[PDB]
Amino acid sequence: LPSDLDQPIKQILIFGGWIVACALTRIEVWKAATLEHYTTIFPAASKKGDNELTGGAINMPTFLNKIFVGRKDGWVEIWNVSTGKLIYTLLPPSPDCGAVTCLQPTPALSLLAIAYSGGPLVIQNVLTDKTVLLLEAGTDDAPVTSISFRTDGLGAGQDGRKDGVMATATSVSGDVTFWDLNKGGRIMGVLRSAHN
């Protein structure tokens, strides 16, 4: 660990030859083949709050050396982790939704699912910066916190032979929610009280 690390360390993410640790407002990146420290990503903000890296960072699968970080502001910033360079930022749609609660890569290529604290799930082309779907998936008191996609190839469309199912859960509830993403992204079922 670096000497000047006085923060808890929220998540770890291993890809390429790099392991990447999103702490709270800071990313420490090691090289995995030698397990050595490489550099440190410092996102910057104008306000005190908006620097905070809630959500996390994730990789897109066919994207070379790029992590996708979510901020306390609605921004999802792409960072090239080789040269340590902020390469793009993508802004929240309808900016009343405030904080990026999570983000997950779809099984489609270069489409990321960003889930904001104001409620919307968006799935966006991350090189076109163009929204593919917009879903009011959460209450403002119950923000969507974990999302995951079914990579099977079937399970939607009221017959079960069409793909595109996404489960999601909020931390304040105990019920998961399944979406069929095909026509506009309708809901298909809610598994209630999966846990307490």
């Binding site: 070379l64 080789s82 793009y88 290529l109 090189l127 009011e136 959460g138 506009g184 309708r186």
Partner: protein, 75 residues
């Protein structure tokens, strides 16, 4: 559908395809050895499309918006 951001590092990166055994399967001929980062990412995209093809959702009405709105299923 033009790409909004462009990376300047993928032009400079170069990668040997015949050296690694995992990257061996994504060359075109039995001559391609040293590949730049853009063509490497292109072959990597082709191979991801080989493993999982692009689903048909990746390619308004009031009741449909009511169904896709998750504030309506509350207890």
């Amino acid at each position: 559908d033009a790409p909004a951001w462009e990376d300047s590092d993928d032009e400079r990166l170069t990668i040997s395809l015949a050296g690694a055994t995992r990257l061996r399967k994504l060359r075109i001929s039995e001559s391609e050895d040293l590949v730049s980062g853009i063509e490497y990412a292109r072959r990597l995209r082709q191979q991801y499309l080989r493993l999982y093809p692009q689903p048909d959702w990746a390619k308004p009405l009031p009741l449909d918006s009511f169904l896709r709105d998750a504030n309506s299923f509350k207890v």
